[PDB]
Amino acid sequence: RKLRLLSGYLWPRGSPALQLVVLICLGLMGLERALNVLVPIFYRNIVNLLTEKAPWNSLAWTVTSYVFLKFLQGGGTGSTGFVSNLRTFLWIRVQQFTSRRVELLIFSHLHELSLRWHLGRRTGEVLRIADRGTSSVTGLLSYLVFNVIPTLADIIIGIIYFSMFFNAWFGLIVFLCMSLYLTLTIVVTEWRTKFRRAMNTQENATRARAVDSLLNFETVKYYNAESYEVERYREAIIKYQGLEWKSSASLVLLNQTQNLVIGLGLLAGSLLCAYFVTEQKLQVGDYVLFGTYIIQLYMPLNWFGTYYRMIQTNFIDMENMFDLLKEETEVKDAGPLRFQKGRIEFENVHFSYADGRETLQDVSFTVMPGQTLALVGPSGAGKSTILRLLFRFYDISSGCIRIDGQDISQVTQASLRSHIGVVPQDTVLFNDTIADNIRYGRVTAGNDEVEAAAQAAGIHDAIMAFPEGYRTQVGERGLKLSGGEKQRVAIARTILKAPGIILLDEATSALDTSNERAIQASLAKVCANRTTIVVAHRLSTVVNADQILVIKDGCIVERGRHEALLSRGGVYADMWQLQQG
Amino acid sequence: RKLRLLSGYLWPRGSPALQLVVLICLGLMGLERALNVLVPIFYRNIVNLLTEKAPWNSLAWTVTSYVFLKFLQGGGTGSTGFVSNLRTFLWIRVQQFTSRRVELLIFSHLHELSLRWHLGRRTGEVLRIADRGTSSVTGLLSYLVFNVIPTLADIIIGIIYFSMFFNAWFGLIVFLCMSLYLTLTIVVTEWRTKFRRAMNTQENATRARAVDSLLNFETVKYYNAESYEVERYREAIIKYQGLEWKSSASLVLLNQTQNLVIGLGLLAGSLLCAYFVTEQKLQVGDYVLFGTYIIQLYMPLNWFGTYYRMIQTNFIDMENMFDLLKEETEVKDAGPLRFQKGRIEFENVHFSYADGRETLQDVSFTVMPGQTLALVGPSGAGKSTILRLLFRFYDISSGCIRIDGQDISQVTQASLRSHIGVVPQDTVLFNDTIADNIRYGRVTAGNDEVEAAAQAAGIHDAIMAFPEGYRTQVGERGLKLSGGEKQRVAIARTILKAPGIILLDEATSALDTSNERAIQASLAKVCANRTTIVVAHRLSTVVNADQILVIKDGCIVERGRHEALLSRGGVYADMWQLQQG
C-alpha cells in the first residue's frame, strides 16, 4: 500500500549496466548470510582436532582456512570485512542514480505549474521539503534492504540451527532471549523521547537570557546591577541541570536492561551446554560454538534502536514530497499561434486576483499593427496587470483576448510567448557574466550580435570603461551593477529576442532624461513595424504615441491621442498641467 | 605547559561530597582494567576442565562464576557492562559542576570590563565563543581520563602478559600488530580531510543555483526557458557526484587496511599457538585464550580515529576562551562618593571617542544644587556625550569633573552611579512583566510604591485599561507596548530609584504635547531640591529652566537663562524664531 511505490525506485528502470549491479549486490547479501554459519562451525572443528591430537600436516590446512574466512567475513560492526564494503563500493553507482532522477523530476515540475511560486510562500521552504524528500527515499531503501531484513533473517537461520544439530531446548533459549532483547529496546526508547523534548525547550530559554542581557549592556550600568544578572543566570542553569539528569540517567537504565537480558540468556544456555558435554552427548567445541554464536547474534540487534526513529521519521518526511508531485497545473493550454501582423484586441475583459475586488472592469481596446499604445494613470490602477494578461500568466474571468484574430486561450502558451517580448518593471539578472544576461533572450546568438544590440540599449560605452570586459560579474540579482546599468541590460535582452510584440512595463524609471531619447529614438527604428505597448509615469515619453489610454481604478475613463485629450480638458489634461508647473 | 590548567578542573576545589565521587570514579577504572585479564583466564580454565572430564559438582561453580564476570565486565562497546555506566551514573554530578562554575566565571566577567560591548562587535558571536568553550573543557577532560589513557594502558598490560605466561614471541606479534593498526589509522584519516572540505564547498555552490532560479520565477517565463535551467542543474549535480565518489570510496580503502592488519596478526599468532599445543608445551584453552583476547584488544583502538579530530579541535576551541578571560578592564576605579548637596562642575573637559576628532572642546559649567540645567543644539553636537561622562562610562582626556567638590575619577564608580539616575534616549526593557521593569530601579520596593510612582509617570491610567493588570508582557526590548508607553515606563523606573542627580536624555520624544506637562509638573515636585540636567530638541520645555547651554560642535557658544538669550539675538534666538513660524 505504501511500499508499492518504494520498490519502484529499487530497480533502476533502464541502463542495464546498472541492472547487473543490483543482482550482484543482492548476491553478496546471500553469501554474507552463509558466512555466519561457516566460521563458527570451522572454529568448533579446530578445537576438536586439537583435542584428538591430530597431526600437524592435517591441521595447518584447517587453521589457514579459518583465518581466511575471518578476513572474508566481517569482524564486529567496527571492522567490517571484505564481502561487505564490496557491496558498498558497488552500491554508490545505484544511489547516485536515484538521487539524480528524483530531484530532476520535481525541479522540472516546479517550473510548469502556475504563477503561484510553487504553491508555497517562500522558496526557501519549498526547496527544503524537496532536498529532504530526496535524501529520504534513498536512506529508507538502504535501511530496509541491507540493515533490517538481513538482521531479521539471521536469527531465523539461527533457530532452525540449534534446532537441527542441537538438543532442541537451545533454540527456545535463543528465541526467548532475542525477543526480550527487542521488546525492551523499542519500549524504553520511546519512553525516553519524552525526556529530551522537554530538554531542548529549556536550553533555548536559558540561552535567551544571556544574549538579551548583553544586547543592552547600555542599560544595565545605569541602575548598577552587574551581579543581579549573575544571580538569575545561575538560577536558570540549575533548572536546566535537573532536566538533563533525567535524560542522562535514563540511558543508564536502558543499558542495564539490555545487559541483564543477554546476561541471563548466556547463563541458562552455557550451564546447560556444559552439562550435556559431561553426559558425552556433545563434546568440547560445541561449548565454544555457543559462546561465539550468541555474541555475533545480538550486536546487529543493537542498532535497531537508532533505526526505529530514522525509519518512522522517513514516512512523514517522504509523503510530503509525493503529493507535492500531485499538484494540478490549472493553467494548461491546441495548435501553435500563427503570428502574421500583430493586431491586439481586448473585448470586455474582467479580471480578479482573489475574488474580493475586480481589478480590471470592462477593459477594451484595439491596437493596429505597427502602432504604439500608451497606458497612463496613478499607482495601483491596473497598468502592469494588462501586460500580465497579454502574456498569459493568468486566466481571465470573462471576455476575450485576440492576437491577429486568434484567442490566446486556445493556442499553446509556449508559442504565444515566443512572439511577445516584455521588459519587467524591476529587473532581475542571473548570477553570472553580463554577456550571458544579454544573450539569454536568443541563446543561439553570437558575440557579434550581443555587442550590436547592446549599442541600441545605450550601455555599450559604459561596459568598456569597466575592467574584465563583457564577462564581468553582476552578483546575485544584478545588485553589483547599478540601478540604471541593471535596467539597460533588460532593454538589451529584449532586442536580441526581436519579438513581434514588444511590451515595456518600466524602461526609463532609473534612467535620467538624457538617456531615454538615446534609447527611445533607438527603439523607434526597432519598433518601426512591430507592435509596442508602453506604460510610463513620466508623461513626456508618450507624446508621440499613437493612442493614449488612461486607467484610474481598472476602468478606462478616456482614450485618444495626445492633442485630443489636452483640448478635451479631462483627467489627462489635469495630469499634464500638474507636471508642467 | 597546557595540561597544567586542564587538571585544575578535574579536582572540584570544594564541596568534599564531590571530592569523594572523583575517587570512586577513579577506583572503578582500576577495577575495569583487572576484568580484562580475569574473564579471558576464566574461559581457558573452563575449557581445560571440560577436556579433563571433571565432575559436574566441581564445574557448575566455575561456569556461573564466569557468566557473572561477563555481566560485571562489559561486552563489546555496544552493550556496556555494569562496572562501566556506574561511573557514568556517578560522573554526571561532576560534569554538572564544571559546566556551572566555568560559565558563571565568564558571564560574571563580561559585565565588568568596559563600555566596549565585550571587546567584540556583536554579542551573538561572543556568547558563541563562550558556550563553545564551556562544552570543550568538559569534553576534553572526559576523553583523556576515560577513553584514551585506559585504552593505552590496556595494551601495556597485554604485552607484559603474553610475555609472562607465554612463549615470548607472542608479545612481539601483539606489539607489531597494534602499532601498525594505529599508524595506518591516523595517517589515512588526515589524508581524507582533504577530500570532504572540497566536497562541502561544491554542494553549497550547487544548491545556490536551484534557489536563485526560483527566487525569480518571474523572469524565466518571459524568454521561455523552463528546460535550460534543467540542463544546467544536471550539469552541476554531476560535477558534485564526482567529488563525493572520492570521499565514499576512500573510506573503503580505510576499512581494507584496518582489516588486513588484524587479519595477519591473527594469522601469524594463531598458527604459531596451534603448533605449541601440538608440542605439548601448551594445551587446549591457551588457543582459545588467544582468539578471545585479541578481539577485545583492538576495538577500543578503533574509535581513536574519531578522537584524533575532536581533541585537536578542542585546543583551538579552548584557548580562545582563556585569553577572553585575560582582557584588561582599563576603566577601573578608593573610598565611596560622599554625596551631600549635588553640585556638578566641569573644568575644561576634553574628550575623544577614537582620537580622530575632539568631540567635546573646553566644556565648562557649574550647576548649583536644586537647579535645572538645559542643553540644546543640533543633532550630533555632543549633548548625550556630556551625560555619558557625568555617569562615567568613559574616562576623560584632560580637565576635571567634580560632584560636591569631589572628583568622580577618584571615588568608586559603584558609588558614583548610585546617586545618579538617567533615563536613556531610546529605552529598552527586560523581557518580562512591566511591574518588574518599573521596580528594577529600587528592587527592594513593594507593590504599593511601584503603583504610586507610576502615577507620576502618567501611565497609571493606561495600564488599567489593559488586560492582565501590571504583570502583562512587553515582549523582548519592550516592542509589544508602544513608542510612548515604552517611554513612560523609563521615567517611572527612575522615580523609584529617587536619585540625588536626575538626568534626562530624551523624555518627551514619543509623547504628545498634552503628556509632557502632565509629567513636567509632576517631575517638578520630584525635582524640587534635587539636581536635574535636561536636554530636549523641542524648545518649549526648557523655558522655565535655570540655565540654558547651547552646543554647536562640542563647544559652548552662549549660555544663560531664557530671556537673556532672546534679547541677545544669538544662535538661540534664531533657533527660537525658527520654531514660532
Residue numbers in the entry:
A (entry chain B), B (entry chain A): 244 to 576, 580 to 827
What did the paper state?
We solved the apo-state cryo-EM structure of human hABCB6 in nanodiscs at the resolution of 3.6 Å according to the Fourier shell correlation (FSC) 0.143 criterion. The hABCB6 apo-state structure shows an inward-facing conformation due to the absence of ATP. The overall structure shows an elongated shape with 130 Å in height and the two NBDs, like two “legs”, are separated by a distance of 35 Å. The TMD contains six transmembrane helices, among which TM4 and TM5 insert into the other hABCB6 monomer in the homodimeric transporter. In the apo-state, hABCB6 adopts an inward-facing conformation and TMDs of hABCB6 contain the substrate-binding cavity which is divided into two parts: a closed cavity 2 and an open-form cavity 1, different from the consecutive substrate-binding pocket found in most ABC transporters. The TMD region of hABCB6 contains a loop “plug”, just like a gate, which includes a sequence of “GGGTGSTG” in the middle region of TMD. The “plug” intervening TM2a and TM2b from one monomer interacts with TM5 and TM6 from another monomer of hABCB6, indicating that the “plug” is important for maintaining apo-form conformation and may undergo conformational changes during the transport process. The distance between those two “plugs” is about 6 Å and it is impassable for the substrates such as porphyrin. In the inward-facing conformation, the “plug” within the middle of the TMD region, and the upper constriction sites containing residues Y286 and V531, together forbid the access of substrate translocation. In the apo-state, the “plug” in TMD not only plays a role as a barrier to forbid the entry of substrates to cavity 2, but also maintains interactions with the neighboring monomer.
